[model samples]
Target chain A: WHPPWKLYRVISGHLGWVRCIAVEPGNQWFVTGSADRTIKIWDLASGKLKLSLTGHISTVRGVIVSTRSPYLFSCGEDKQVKCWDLEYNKVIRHYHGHLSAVYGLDLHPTIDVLVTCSRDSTARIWDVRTKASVHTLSGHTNAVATVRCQAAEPQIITGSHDTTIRLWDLVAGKTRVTLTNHKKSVRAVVLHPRHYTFASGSPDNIKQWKFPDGSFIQNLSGHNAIINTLTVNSDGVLVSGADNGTMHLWDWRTGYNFQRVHAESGIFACAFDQSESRLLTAEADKTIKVYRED
Target chain B: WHPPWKLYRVISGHLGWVRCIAVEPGNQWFVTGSADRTIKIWDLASGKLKLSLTGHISTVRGVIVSTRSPYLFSCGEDKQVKCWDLEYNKVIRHYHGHLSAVYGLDLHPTIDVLVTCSRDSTARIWDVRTKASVHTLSGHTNAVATVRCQAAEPQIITGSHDTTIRLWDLVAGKTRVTLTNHKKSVRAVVLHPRHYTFASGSPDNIKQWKFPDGSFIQNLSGHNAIINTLTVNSDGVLVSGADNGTMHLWDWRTGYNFQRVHAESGIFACAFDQSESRLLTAEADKTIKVYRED
Candidate 1:
């Protein structure tokens, strides 16, 4: 038998709940951060643990491997944002300004800039190599949960527990506009891979915006769950996972709900290679799942 | 709380599973045909049974209350189609040509014409006052399940179990074009009340088409159920009821799934009043549900 499970693969390693995941650009490996205060790397094809790195004193909440550089970025409840040199597996730099837990991290698509949001209510822009806090985005009144960066105008976007989303002018370190439509905490913000837009998710619903300027588009509205995270594939498919143990897949262009599954597990983090073949999810069960299209 | 339900009404009268429903244009009443071989008219305001008309020898599968005339139309497995004069409360006309069950019925928006589809694989066009079948559409290889009419060219459209949709040239009493997009039987076809487009339903998906010429618009995918009936109101909300007891509500313009509900009873038919405030569903439970949206 060729294996009939997806063969849906479940690889175990995390001593605590796996909190976040990001795939490497070469499609050979991926990394995950967890509440266990460690970052683990795994081979994408074989689902084998490659190594584990420890530095964060508390739960790790966010991790992302840069598509263009040899750097790995991570944020955690330890109030630390670390940039790792993948060639040596060393924590080469630290962003030291957060007064509370660091919750989200993302790398600039083109520049050497790194961005991270924190429960301290500010999102910090840093010069990745030197780790200088270039700008402390301070408009959000509550904890900022998500951050994303693009190369265009208003490059930085952040979602906050203040029930708001702020688009920032990356050049001047100033807030360009604040979106106040969401009535609940905006937990997830994701940029579409091929489109010039972004989607912000909350308990109310996920609302899409046309970007460069962040104009209100339409709501991918339904499944009024507390969206924990949002991700989009290159095929224009957007998937949002919820705290209610529900997941919704949508067509980003039409805001159409294409599929929905409400299994018992609350999906916390997920990743996919460029080919979207080796889909992986970091879960509540302290295990990582690899989904193969075959 | 003032009528905490919007006071959603359930009017009980039909002795068999209600198969079809139609709302009066004036908004005071509505009617439904049932497997009990009877048509019941109900008062919308009080949910009271106004009257019952019996004539069909078999289950009545289709029903309609005309907007411009004081007439009610119904068709059934009896292979009989009847036109009733509301002024006299009597069967005013009958067109009997189908060799098998009559499944669908519709009235032309501005023309004094009526159309019906039958399980015998033919759709018949008739002059409402005359009991004669003007055109016996005969190209469909299998049973025709649904029919709709408008005042414009290609006024007649029908969906068939032959996996095709035919746009009829009412001027020539022949097929204008046969849409072969569906690979499965198309059981329902609905015309948008405010747009020059229509949607056809099959087990594959609901495909919306732009009319007069019926060009493919887009597919409202994700629900791969045997769609039993489709209905749209002036609000541009398209609802399709499936044999799996799933009801999908959609935005016609964007093909977005707005809401979905899976009840125990598969919805056989549904209709909305002109104001779009009141919605009614004929169900497998042998009862009609009246939903107030105000």
Candidate 2:
């Protein structure tokens, strides 16, 4: 249902490669985490940097802007995660439990809960308000690469280098099912914005499935490179970024790649704005590119 | 066999999407045709705009540099093909036969013969010096999208929107083989620089075939969108661009995908310089990007 998009503007300020990006619901501002160990906020209208938060000791890999509050959550290779209060313009809390570099993080859609995965091969749920660890989900033998959770449900999904996807039930605080269909490292997993379905991406192929019951749906194969990130919008448009700098925009209903965007550098993360009119991509070229459908 | 390539320069001058690009053999300058009804000449090393040729009344779709002479050939939606003398900076000849827009053009490696495909459902071989149409190959039920010639053989290949690939014997003036493997529009076809093989790209997949005899060899399937253009280097590195704005770099011999590059707009044409160290891509964003292997 989306029209063809074009390059709107490019936001370049990061000294190192941009690792992750999260757009706010109002479509006014967005935040980016970079290898420079810094997080910066930018205004979408003016394409100007608004603020910079520098505290992480190493590369900042993950970031998300809360839709319900003026809060920002980020994790990094420094083995630490921080929650920032945009109203106070400072770090409000720090969550530290990962044994190695934290690779990915996703916030609960309607709650203050956050889930993070690390090279230590474990995913932990955290209560940001209490600043305490809620649950430690484990079983993967290798690094946990990505994690995601749905807002309307308590289901959590984690992908790992062990070529497995672990589904966790937050209410029970236990692993409910372990899916092992991917032949290589599962680098990205994303829940559909409005459905009870999710997709996981790997070097070999991308697979879609039904949540809770873990029913196999279909395979979306076409990319010959390792998938770096996956994102979905309310329109059921799924975008997958790969190591080869290719971004595939897929229609989940047909399991068909509807569009593809290429960059000169490897893509690290991508997000859709509230209106689905804009696309933000973090690239290894140390720049954040914005595309808009006019 | 290629080193890691990096974005060296971005040249923005065309008022419309760059449809085709042709690099001079001396690696000094390149020419690009655009939908803006203009052709641009640029310095490869400096990315400087040198000259702009504005004569086409409609979208200029294809452009090619002659290796045997300082001549350039271009075809456009105006239903005419023009040969420009570089030294004289003038249109020397205009061949007219097609009733529709020309879509693709390719020059023979060691001869004065030029091949062009058009929306008029035909591919015509032309004697450039004599300004005459030597043969009009017509059999495709739909528009002919692309055309290519085998460097060391007297065979020409044309891909059509009719989902078929036709191999024509130039000397015999007849169809040698008809390949009906593609399930969608055959958007692009390119012959390998050093091997007796060629590749055709469609929405379904990219098929590699043995040249002259038209035998199926293998498939380089990874792109999830319609492939718009394809180019090859003497090093056997093949690059394909698609509607998804993604470019896949493949090793033609082993059919191994070496790299993937993402751009903001759909790519219409891509090519390599004489040294094979630089890459030039003409994109729908109305820009030409130059990449170098670092």
Which candidate comes out best when scored by lDDT?
2
DockQ for candidate 1? 0.13
In candidate 1, list every pair of residues with a backbone clash: A5-A8
Tell me how far the alpha carbon of residue A253 in candidate 2 is from the true structure, in angstroms, after superposition: 1.1
Using alpha carbons, what is the TM-score of model 2? 0.52
Docking class of 2: incorrect
Off by over 4 Å in 1: A1-7, A292-294, B1-189, B192-197, B200-253, B256-294
Span of ten consecutive residues with least summed lDDT in model 1 chain B? B1-10
- The 10-residue segment of model 2 chain B with minimum total lDDT is B256-265
Q: How well does model 1 score by local distance difference test?
A: 0.84
What DockQ results do all the predictions give, each relative to the true complex? 0.13, 0.02
lDDT for every model? 0.84, 0.86
Give TM-scores for every candidate, taking all chains together and pairing residue i with residue i. 0.63, 0.52
How accurate locally is residue A106 in candidate 2, as Cα lDDT from 0 to 100?
Answer: 88
Off by over 4 Å in 2: A152-154, B1-294
**Winning model by TM-score:** 1
Candidate 2 residue-wise lDDT, B1-294, digit = tens: 344467888899898889999988788999999989999999887889999987899999999999899899999999979999999988999998998999989988766888999999999989999988899998899999999876555478899999999988787667778999898999999887765788999988899998667799988877778799888888777889887688887767767565677664698998888888888999988898888876
